[PDB]
Structures are given as C-alpha cells and as structure tokens.
C-alpha cells in the first residue's frame, strides 16, 4: 500500500489465543508427562 501509514501507528496486533489456551491452568496437569499406552483395536471378525 502507498499510504495507510497514519492508521498503522495506533493499529492493533492480533492477540495470542493459541498459547493462552495452552497455558491455561488445567486439571489434568502432571509433574511429569506420560504418553498413554496403545488402545485395543479391532482385528477382524474372528479375532474381535
């Protein structure tokens, strides 16, 4: 743009929701994170 320039100084950045919601205090938090074990899958009609 040639001139929006006046607008640009009082212009507003867009707020950081991704990490804000990342860093919200959570009720599942754990001192040391553990990844779940692997869940049971369906191996077909004979296996269940």
């Amino acid at each position: 743009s040639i001139y929006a320039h006046a607008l640009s100084q009082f212009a507003v950045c867009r707020q950081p929701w991704n990490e804000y919601i990342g860093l919200l205090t959570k009720q599942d938090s754990t001192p040391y994170h553990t990844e779940p074990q692997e869940k049971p899958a369906y191996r077909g009609r004979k296996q269940g």
Partner: protein, 174 residues
C-alpha cells in the same frame, strides 16, 4: 471367503484396479507383521486411504512459519502441513520383499530387494558429497507446486482456517 489367498476380502474403498482385493497383483499383504496402527492387515495403510472417518484427521497437505504472518503470531505448525508425506510409499512386505519360499527358511536365506527401504548405510552420503551445493541452492527445477499459487504452501494465507471440510463442500445457492 475361507479360501487362503482370498482372505483380504472384497474392498471397494481401495485405490486399486479391482474391487476384489485378492486378485490385485500389485501389493501383496503381510498378515504377520502388518496392521499395528490400521487395525486389520487387509485394510489400506493410513496414507493411502480414499475414505475418511468423522472424528479422524484426513491426509496432510504436503509442503516440500513464513506464510502465516497474517495469522495469530502464536499459532504453531498447522497439523495438516507435512514436510514429508508420500501417498506412494512402499511399505515393506515380507512375502513380496523377503520371500522365503524357495528355501528351507533357515536364518540367512530368502531373496531380498533393497529398493524398498531407504538406505541407512553410510555409503550413500560419503560417495555423494560435493563442493557444489545441493539441488535447492542450484534451483535446477521448473514448475513448483503443481497447482500453481497455493495459499497454504506457496503464497501467504489470509482469513480463516477451516479444519473440518464444511466450506469446502457446499452448494452454490446462486
């Protein structure tokens, strides 16, 4: 179907040239070592699937973050942009690739093709090393992304992310 070699069933939802999976001469499946993450060994691998579930993710768009500048400054790597993703990826299958049939199946025996798995040997990177920088420095290639200018990949991305496909199939009312 109780016949052996007919066990892979009838799947239409494959990408192959027959709807009968057991006549397909391209990819022979492997019942013993396969199907950790796909459930059954018959069913297509995650990257090859042509039909998609409700609460499951679908295929990542390949790249081959700069273009998100207009977005939330925090927003990380969009879960569907993948550096390396191949729809054509040969999964190692023993009955194809390591085939023990003409042998007594003792420890070393069986015929193997090595063109399947990417080489972990040091020989490759030693043999080919050069003062001239790589292909990307040299900009050897024409073309680019095959769809031309793409908002996620080549050019910058503005407005909104739609991760469900809701706008991507809609019906023009006009």
């Amino acid at each position: 179907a109780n016949h052996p070699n007919r066990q892979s069933g009838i799947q239409f939802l494959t990408h192959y040239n027959t709807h009968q999976r057991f006549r397909v001469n391209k990819d022979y499946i492997d019942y013993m070592h396969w199907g950790k993450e796909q459930g059954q060994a018959r069913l297509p691998h995650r990257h090859q699937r042509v039909a998609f579930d409700f609460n499951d993710q679908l295929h990542p768009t390949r790249i081959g973050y700069a273009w998100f500048a207009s977005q939330d400054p925090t927003f990380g790597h969009h879960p569907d942009l993948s550096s390396s993703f191949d729809p054509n990826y040969r999964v190692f299958s023993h009955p194809e690739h390591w085939n023990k049939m003409f042998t007594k199946r003792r420890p070393g025996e069986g015929d193997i093709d090595l063109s399947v798995l990417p080489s972990r040997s040091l020989l490759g990177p030693l043999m080919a090393h050069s003062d001239t920088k790589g292909i990307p420095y040299f900009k050897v290639d024409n073309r680019g992304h095959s769809n031309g200018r793409v908002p996620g990949v080549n050019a910058p991305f503005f407005g909104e992310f739609d991760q469900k496909m809701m706008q991507a199939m809609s019906r023009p009312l006009n």
